[PDB]
Amino acid sequence: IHRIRITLTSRNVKSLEKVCADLIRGAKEKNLKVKGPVRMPTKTLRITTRKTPCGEGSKTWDRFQMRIHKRLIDLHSPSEIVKQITSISIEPGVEVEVTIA
């Protein structure tokens, strides 16, 4: 079997891109094929709430946005190198799900 999908996600795009470059460079340094970083659409969680803690005042709202950036990367490689690369002490703020399909 040579079908492995790794899901990368984070709120911060800097860490996401750095860890994606880490994974791609780790895959390509050793003789191995790897797909490009599929870039899934960003999810914009929107919540609007009145600023005031009471009923008085002009109706001014707060629009809190929360951006979730997620990527999927394919891998045709033995599971050993995948497990070694996954345990590379990734940067904080990034959630990773390595799936062996």
- Residue numbers at the binding site for other proteins (CB under 8 A): 11, 45-47, 49-51, 53, 62-66
Q: Which is nearer to other proteins, 61 or 100 (CB)?
A: 61
Give the bridge partners for 76, in sequence order: none
Amino acid (one-letter) located at 81: I
Q: Which is nearer to other proteins, 7 or 12 (CB)?
A: 12
Question: Shortest distance, CB of residue 98 to other proteins, whole angstroms?
Answer: 23
Question: Shortest distance, CB of residue 30 to other proteins, whole angstroms?
Answer: 36
Give the bridge partners for 4, in sequence order: 75, 100
Q: Which is nearer to other proteins, 52 or 79 (CB)?
A: 52
80, 9, 39, 25: CA torsion to nearest 10: -40
